Design an enzyme around this catalytic site. Structure first.
Site, short mmCIF file in Angstrom:
data_model
loop_
_atom_site.label_atom_id
_atom_site.label_comp_id
_atom_site.label_asym_id
_atom_site.label_seq_id
_atom_site.Cartn_x
_atom_site.Cartn_y
_atom_site.Cartn_z
N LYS A 52 0.84 -1.19 0.00
CA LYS A 52 0.00 0.00 0.00
C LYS A 52 0.87 1.24 0.00
CE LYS A 52 -4.38 -1.35 0.67
NZ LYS A 52 -5.38 -1.32 -0.42
N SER A 75 -7.18 -12.64 0.98
CA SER A 75 -6.89 -11.22 0.85
C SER A 75 -7.84 -10.41 1.71
CB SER A 75 -7.00 -10.78 -0.62
OG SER A 75 -6.09 -9.73 -0.91
N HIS A 100 -4.77 -14.43 -10.14
CA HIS A 100 -5.56 -13.32 -9.63
C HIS A 100 -6.85 -13.23 -10.43
CE1 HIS A 100 -6.53 -9.44 -7.81
NE2 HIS A 100 -5.52 -9.65 -6.98
#
Ligand SMILES: [Mg+2]
Ligand SMILES: [Mg+2]
Ligand SMILES: [Mg+2]
Lengths: 399, 399, 153, 158
Positions: free
Chosen positions: A162, A342, A283
């Site tokens: 992040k 996640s 993903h």
């Protein structure tokens, strides 16, 4: 019975409630949540779905052959109360060479666009062993990455960086190093993180290599980074893969991330077959249209995970109707596809989550869980919680 | 105003209603139909969508940089009554090299799976010319196919072969010849038609070549076949492509069909860049999850067609919010993506449909339209209707 | 009918007189002149021939699968007076790539050496078009030689 | 003692994994030899390459659980000589240890040319002559043909 009498002959050709053995090995089995799109009942729309998803003979054509009738998908079970339709697809319909996108094109392709259904959700599929023979499945597993990491008795600890994007290669590599040196084993590229102008792909790869090397030196423990190799075309994806190989990382230290939905199933299969020794990180960004419960038309998360395993993904993100065994027997079977977790998994919630899953064989990439004591402190707390769970000691006692 | 006051600072970093010029050329513009998923208003959910689709900084992180703030997607316009949200994406976020799947991963990726929204439909996008520079667009167009076919003033006449599957290579080639010799110009493989065991791909290609040669000799007019090149991986798809090239068909006689949704956008881009001289037929089987009106989460058919055009598809199947011009100026612009019409277009309904479209620049692959006088007779009737429309004579008068 | 009753379950797995369509395109159809080799009736020997020529499961084995049952050759027609047996061979049994010797190995291979038959003559075979797709066939013909020779009539 | 071998039942219709599992079951029980069925080839439900890989894995597992080496006989009879050579090379490059694999050939149906080609291209490999189809020549009910002794002598000569 009466619904059968409602059907026309062409529709009758796609319905067989007296199918002797749906699990005889000739059929892929699929169960749909089906609601007809006006003026049709559930069996009429089911026959239309079976026709459109196998052979498309719903009208009288002089080109119909008995063999094409043999290739018909058959509605063999219906549940009027629950609006459930079971359809048997002869897996001879599917393209040879382990083509997964071909199966998806058949069973969740044009049927999703049919006006004959107001709702059409593929809830589950069942693969016979004879069909499972045709597909690769995973070749690199979470056990291989556990062997490389020398990590057992705890889930693999991962993180996202992040901010997701807008960081330089050095900034992203520094955040990855912070998590790694804090005790974390796994860092993944953001699913759209690629050769952006402010974070060039080659610079990002080299900086991640340097950060991983220094984190390994400072910790002694090996570390794994998941690189997004999703690209515009196959050549760019292969070039980025080779760049990761020739960086050169030690084998096992890098995982190939692929956006299986947007980049496509062909890219997943290409990664599986060109790099069987690399963890294929599936993903599923974009899956929400297929899988979200608010969407009546699509397929379930279970179906997506099963097809990701079939395509050869080593792991897929995670966040019924068939007794599915993933052999290959009625080499012995198909290797596991690791669940990847996640979103906001702090050490406080680590033990209840491991209790919920029932096993430790999953990667958990934390999101907002711990991103003012530092990322290294948070990763150390996560490692301490994992060790407390392994020892059986309570978190409060271990604190 | 009040909704702005509701936002926290991290959410405030993704909302700018005072954005000076969204069309300044720095932003991809996207309008979403948004309904928040409980306890959030439309603006908080919009800020969450903008964060998750650009940079994902909705919490306090010490790694936040001013440049990553510059890369924030910004909600710049909202419509409370219609639940519409306009988000500007700095297109520097997107992978360089004309990566379309990267854009889709950004804007219709993980945002679809967010619990923050109960409905999230991408209705339209706007591409600035500076961003349009990075992407190929189509290189082979319907005008190129018209030049090869020496067909103008009428829509390209296409068909699907019924049954969709279960026919042998000779049977499929015979049906294609039956349509071609009757005046039809275009025949497409079914979207899952591939190397099936009962219809091997090489045999299908050879038999289709023989049938096309025979139809051209019997008619004098050139013919086009659309081959499904969707495969398991890169190598199988390009092998099938090269097999089509080395059959060898005359250039322009073959189009490459790709299942853009299931096979993926990298396959479409790879076909576009490896075969710019070939019509790239974009089949959208599977799009229903994104595009169906019953699905609140996804993106519209217009968005899919725009991104197919951006990826380089020559034509896409068909069956608002931005004033989008496909230049490339504030080489001059992006080539057109041909609409492909599917389903039951008999000669009776041909003229009103051409009136509805407003032009004759589309391929129309008939489904249940005419599939007992013969497929050749039906194709001849369709050609006669096209000529009647070109002459301006009414169908009844021409009959 | 009674001959069916004479069969055991494993032999029953290779006999289906109620085969819906032998020409559906899934089967190579083969008609044999069959006389059993002592102590067996024509249907028992026919079932043995079908087993040995397709999947060879004439005994109880724990490795039997439903798909292997799907691959069984089936006796679907018999002619007691003429000692004729019709057997449907799922051509999925045959080696891919147009292997002809593999078909011959299946249907006129080990069955010829079986003691269960005193006579076993494959009289005719019927190839479905879907099976015919797998095989080349001739590419040069007598017409090509006629064109080279400029000889006709 | 005689070399102990087995055929896998069912002859056909088993998957590569199922066939390999049956071969391992026989091998780990002490059996030395497992052969492909004489038509067992690149069938769609038991692909040849997958069968070879699964048999290699099963043989490795049986060798580890037994310590004794094992031999599998692969049917290399094909449509043409190119496919036969391809299947032979695939067996070689699996890669089995030399001596662990035998090449099975249908000498009657595939022909004596295939037998001689195997003998000359792979002199270091056991050439397993399967005589499926010999019954027309050799059966006593057939007055026209040749004896089993003649067939064995010519197989040795080839
Ligand atoms: Mg993410
Ligand atoms: Mg279609
Ligand atoms: Mg045998």
């Amino acid at each position: 019975t009466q619904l059968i009498k409602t059907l026309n002959i062409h529709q009758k050709g796609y319905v067989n409630f007296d199918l002797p053995n749906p699990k005889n090995g000739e059929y892929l089995l699929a169960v749909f949540h089906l609601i007809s799109g006006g003026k049709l009942n559930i069996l009429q729309a089911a026959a239309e779905v079976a026709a459109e998803s196998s052979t498309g003979t719903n009208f009288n054509v002089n080109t119909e052959t008995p063999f094409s009738k043999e290739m018909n998908a058959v509605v063999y079970q219906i549940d009027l109360d629950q609006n459930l339709v079971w359809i048997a697809y002869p897996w001879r319909l599917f393209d040879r060479g382990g083509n997964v996108q071909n199966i998806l094109t058949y069973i969740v392709g044009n049927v999703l666009g049919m006006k004959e259904v107001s709702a059409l959700k593929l809830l589950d599929v069942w693969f016979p062993p004879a069909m499972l023979e045709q597909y690769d499945g995973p070749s690199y597993t979470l056990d291989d990455m556990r062997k490389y990491l020398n990590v057992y008795d705890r889930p693999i600890l991962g993180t996202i960086i992040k901010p997701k994007m807008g960081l330089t290669s050095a900034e992203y590599a520094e955040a990855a190093y912070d998590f790694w040196v804090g005790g974390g084993d796994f860092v993944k590229n953001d699913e759209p993180q690629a050769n952006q102008d402010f974070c060039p792909y080659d610079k990002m790869v080299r900086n991640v290599k340097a950060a991983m090397d220094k984190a390994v030196k400072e910790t002694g423990n090996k570390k794994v980074h998941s690189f997004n190799v999703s690209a515009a075309d196959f050549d760019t994806m292969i070039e980025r893969c080779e760049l990761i190989r020739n960086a050169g990382f030690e084998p096992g230290s890098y995982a190939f991330l692929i956006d299986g939905i947007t980049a496509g199933w062909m890219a997943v299969q290409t990664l599986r077959r060109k790099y069987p020794d690399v963890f294929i990180h599936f993903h599923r960004a974009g899956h929400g249209s297929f899988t979200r419960p608010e969407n009546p038309i699509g397929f379930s998360v279970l179906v997506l995970s099963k097809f990701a395993r079939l395509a050869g993904a080593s792991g897929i993100h995670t966040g019924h109707f068939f007794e599915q065994e993933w052999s290959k027997i009625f080499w012995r079977g198909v290797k596991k596809c690791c669940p990847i977790i996640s979103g906001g998994l702090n050490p406080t919630l680590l033990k209840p989550f491991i209790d919920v899953m029932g096993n430790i064989d999953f990667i958990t990439t934390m999101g907002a869980g711990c991103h003012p004591k530092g990322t290294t402190a948070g990763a150390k707390a996560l490692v301490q919680a994992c060790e407390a769970y392994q020892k059986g000691i309570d978190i409060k006692e271990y604190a």
